[PDB]
Amino acid sequence: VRHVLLRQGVLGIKVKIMLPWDPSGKIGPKKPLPDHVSIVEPKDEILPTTPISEQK
Amino acid sequence: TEQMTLRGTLKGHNGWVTQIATTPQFPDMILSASRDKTIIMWKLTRDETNYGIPQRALRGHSHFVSDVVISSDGQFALSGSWDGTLRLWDLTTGTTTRRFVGHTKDVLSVAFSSDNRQIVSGSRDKTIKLWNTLGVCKYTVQDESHSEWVSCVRFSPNSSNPIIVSCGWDKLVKVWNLANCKLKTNHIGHTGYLNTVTVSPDGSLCASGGKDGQAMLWDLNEGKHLYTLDGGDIINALCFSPNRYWLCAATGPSIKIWDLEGKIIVDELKQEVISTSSKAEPPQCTSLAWSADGQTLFAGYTDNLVRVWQVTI
């Protein structure tokens, strides 16, 4: 909030800004999402399995 | 002919039976674990009005007790629990000797060696680890380990050599030899995650099962895939017989007792058939263990009961 003068009265300035970091770092604001708290979802899914014995 | 009669049923739990084991030193004891966060030591009367009474109840856990195993003397007892710790009991009044500190997640499987000097653990850490009886870490396995949760580990009876089984949810069975702590082999097989594995009393076999519910047979020392059998929907626990070459497979509505020579199903154990609907009309059977007599076997269910059976000729 900052007041600024002119020759006729005062004018009010206000600025509101939203911080974007969610992946990582600084870390400054925390990693979860704010308003709708999202489910961070990785993916892997493969199989090629068949029976065999492999000696080590 | 060798067939099965329904012996009786025990009562004394508020949580699902997770495991049961029995020492051959005292077959007149029997030990149990459950998700009421206590392991119950029983007093077996052979009267058919009941079939046993709880003698004492060992207490002190903040989450489920997954697996339990007896000592070779029957004077100690050990537990693995989903609070990330283990306890070493003195099965005469209570009074834990030692609690084993160090895991970041659940301890699912646990087993107690023949010489009573080596104790292992399977964890959702994705680490097999070895434990001195003093309660400190002889070794930790973090290289060539499972890439998913460790389902069950076993100590193998052998001529003298050190071999231990390991199986995880990465659909593989790893066999480990101590004093190099290397992969003896990798066995590939089973679609879907592995629940259980168990070793023959002679020790040259590994009967494995899982989500697949198929019973594949492996050779410990030959390293060969013998064969596969259709064991039903899912098999959660397995246990060989001590006095036969049978194999007893725990499926949901029934227990399937299999003769191995030749390969055939002997009978299917059915419990009470009480009218209920529709998703699991009877409770699933989840654990099972033979008595050392080999006449009687026991079962763990999710209705908080242990059903008994007996072989009749």
Side-chain angles (χ1 to χ4, degrees):
Chain A
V1 184
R2 286 292 181 252
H3 294 52
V4 58
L5 284 60
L6 288 177
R7 55 176 294 179
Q8 293 180 2
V10 186
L11 301 176
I13 304 299
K14 293 186 289 184
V15 173
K16 186 178 185 183
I17 307 184
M18 187 171 176
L19 307 177
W21 289 286
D22 294 296
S24 253
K26 307 295 186 179
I27 297 179
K30 301 183 178 180
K31 306 296 87 177
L33 277 72
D35 192 62
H36 297 74
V37 187
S38 298
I39 296 77
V40 182
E41 185 64 59
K43 182 185 181 298
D44 187 61
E45 183 176 1
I46 49 173
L47 68 167
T49 56
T50 48
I52 192 58
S53 295
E54 176 59 62
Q55 292 186 345
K56 293 295 191 66
Chain B
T1 192
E2 296 179 356
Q3 57 187 357
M4 294 284 185
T5 190
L6 183 66
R7 178 68 282 178
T9 305
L10 299 173
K11 297 180 180 179
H13 286 296
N14 193 34
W16 302 351
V17 182
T18 53
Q19 275 297 120
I20 43 181
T22 306
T23 182
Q25 305 300 295
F26 305 128
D28 300 294
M29 295 187 180
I30 181 166
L31 191 60
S32 60
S34 277
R35 296 190 173 198
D36 56 11
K37 310 180 182 64
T38 52
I39 62 177
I40 304 299
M41 188 271 289
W42 298 75
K43 177 65 172 63
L44 290 171
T45 51
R46 301 299 181 172
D47 304 298
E48 57 181 0
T49 307
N50 54 8
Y51 199 66
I53 311 92
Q55 178 54 241
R56 286 184 289 101
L58 293 303
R59 293 173 288 108
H61 297 99
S62 51
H63 217 305
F64 310 148
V65 183
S66 46
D67 287 9
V68 64
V69 59
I70 42 73
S71 188
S72 300
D73 303 303
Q75 300 297 114
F76 304 90
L78 186 120
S79 55
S81 293
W82 286 29
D83 56 8
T85 55
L86 294 78
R87 282 175 164 80
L88 174 56
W89 299 92
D90 290 308
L91 196 61
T92 50
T93 307
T95 188
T96 55
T97 310
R98 185 62 178 176
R99 55 179 180 272
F100 295 0
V101 181
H103 289 290
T104 54
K105 297 180 177 179
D106 299 355
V107 178
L108 293 177
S109 52
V110 74
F112 196 74
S113 58
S114 301
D115 61 357
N116 307 341
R117 186 55 178 166
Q118 288 182 354
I119 311 170
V120 284
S121 52
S123 296
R124 291 189 163 147
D125 294 356
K126 308 175 185 181
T127 58
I128 309 91
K129 179 179 289 185
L130 187 54
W131 291 93
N132 293 102
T133 50
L134 302 177
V136 292
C137 300
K138 191 183 292 295
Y139 194 69
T140 303
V141 189
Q142 57 180 12
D143 295 299
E144 307 182 299
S145 300
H146 302 288
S147 300
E148 293 187 56
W149 298 337
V150 184
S151 55
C152 189
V153 295
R154 291 294 183 183
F155 279 106
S156 298
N158 292 117
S159 301
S160 192
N161 61 11
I163 309 180
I164 59 179
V165 188
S166 296
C167 59
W169 282 40
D170 61 352
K171 60 183 73 177
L172 291 170
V173 181
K174 294 178 169 62
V175 180
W176 301 82
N177 294 320
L178 302 174
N180 293 107
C181 304
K182 64 179 188 66
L183 297 172
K184 188 180 184 65
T185 187
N186 295 301
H187 297 310
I188 309 183
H190 304 281
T191 51
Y193 63 94
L194 298 170
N195 283 114
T196 190
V197 66
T198 185
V199 288
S200 52
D202 298 294
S204 54
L205 292 172
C206 292
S208 299
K211 184 188 172 66
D212 198 4
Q214 295 180 354
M216 294 182 179
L217 278 296
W218 301 96
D219 291 345
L220 191 64
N221 301 300
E222 302 296 298
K224 294 179 174 62
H225 180 56
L226 294 180
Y227 49 85
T228 304
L229 293 170
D230 296 297
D233 189 59
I234 186 168
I235 295 178
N236 297 302
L238 285 166
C239 193
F240 288 96
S241 291
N243 59 345
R244 297 182 180 89
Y245 294 129
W246 283 352
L247 181 60
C248 203
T251 61
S254 54
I255 305 177
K256 299 175 68 178
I257 176 57
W258 290 349
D259 179 48
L260 195 277
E261 297 177 1
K263 302 182 295 183
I264 191 57
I265 184 159
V266 189
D267 293 299
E268 289 183 358
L269 297 179
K270 294 300 301 300
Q271 51 272 9
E272 190 59 61
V273 293
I274 189 62
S275 52
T276 313
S277 294
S278 50
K279 297 281 88 176
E281 169 176 0
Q284 296 190 359
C285 188
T286 182
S287 53
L288 73 182
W290 289 87
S291 192
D293 301 297
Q295 292 186 346
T296 51
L297 61 95
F298 294 89
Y301 283 94
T302 56
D303 60 355
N304 310 340
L305 302 177
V306 167
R307 294 186 172 97
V308 194
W309 282 265
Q310 190 179 15
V311 174
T312 46
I313 304 177

